[PDB]
Ligand code: HEM
């Protein structure tokens with residue numbers, strides 16, 4: 001039969017100008033609802049949302065991915081690995097009711113792109129076309145990664161997402177944003193100090209800090225520094241592996257190379273398992289709130 | 295003044311949540327990712343001893359008064375371009391006034 005084909009169909013008579021408007025409504029609510037999670041904002045939970053809805057992809061049979069926008073169905077919504085993301089959805093539904101034409105996948109992925117760009121990150125080309133699929137196409141839980149693992153896991157996990165060494169290290173740099181919540185995943189604390197501004201802090205802190213392995217209040221083991229930060233076992237594994245270590249080092253020296261590689265990778269992650277016809281529009285590069293005078 | 299004056303109690307939450315991951319609570323207090331803010335008002339930009347500021351922060355050489363202070367907190371990278379102060383900014387006037395009021399009292 002060969003895998004299922006997911007063709008990208010542009011929403012009836014919509015263009016760049018329409019999506020720039022969806023972006024702005026999100027980016028403004030990102031600026032307005034700045035009280036959330038001890039003033040980190042909703043920026044990180046949005047990039048974690050875009051990653052989890054796309055992280056369900058399986059290259060072998062084309063199941064999962066951002067296309068279907070299946071995160072709205074109870075099964076994937078209540079995934080133990082999607083804990084805390086309900087807050088990302090509550091942030092986006094008032095914006096979905098303001099733009100009912102946009103598909104679910106398009107919105108969650110656009111939420112991630114808007115958040116990175118707004119948190120002074122690289123310009124991420126985004127494409128429209130994802131179309132809502134039914135409840136029977138919703139992926140079964142546990143396709144997402146486990147944090148309590150090593151480098152050998154990470155390398156073989158991402159192979160399913162069609163990502164190479166350089167892509168996963170780049171994609172992991174998004175951990176410079178936010179924190180781990182004990183009530184959500186069993187791990188507590190941030191990876192850095194600049195929780196809502198997209199930098200290469202993740203790599204710097206990984207090699208420049210004093211990491212001691214301790215246990216938290218959820219009884220799980222994590223690497224903590226004297227500075228008050230943390231790293232997951234999968235994070236720390238990036239400096240344990242010799243191949244991943246020489247890329248972590250490269251991004252710690254050059255932020256512009258990191259910004260160049262994340263945008264390639266993050267776009268790829270959100271576009272994984274979507275076929276674009278040749279008549280489809282070239283990827284959109286959205287203007288930030290700062291670029292329009294706000 | 296043009297900046298009101300309000301909260302020392304409410305800016306204490308705004309400081310502990312949005313700044314304390316660097317910003318210290320005492321004189322002699324350590325520089326971290328950023329400097330100790332004691333004696334900040336009435337002193338120029340880039341003058342705290344024992345810290346390595348970016349050329350851009352010492353270069354900007356402006357006396358930190360309550361007014362040019364709130365223009366910096368709104369957008370740190372637009373006021374001082376090249377600053378390593380990784381902060382998005384306080385987009386609300388209440389948030390800025392409440393914090394400057396706490397910073398006037400705490401950084402005496
Ligand atoms: C919303 C509250 C904030 C206020 C009142 C504020 C205010 C200030 C001021 C006035 C300075 C300049 C000091 C000088 O030049 O002598 C400064 C520097 C600094 N603060 Fe903040 N800031 C805020 C939040 C944060 C956050 C989120 C971080 C944590 C990453 C932080 C990190 C720093 C750093 C890294 C510098 C040093 C910049 C450099 O050396 O170029 N601050 N802050």
Ligand code: ZNH
Pocket residue numbers: 044045047048051083084145146147154171172174175177178179180181182184185186187232234266
């Ligand atoms: C291997 C692999 C991996 C892993 C295991 C992880 C894991 C993890 C965890 C556990 C957490 C926490 C949760 C809570 O809330 O508590 C997170 C978060 C997270 N994450 Zn990530 N990651 C990852 C990847 C990732 C990627 C790829 C990205 C992107 C691009 C991310 C982004 C993220 C963010 C941003 C966050 C934050 C969120 C918040 O803040 O809320 N991430 N993280």
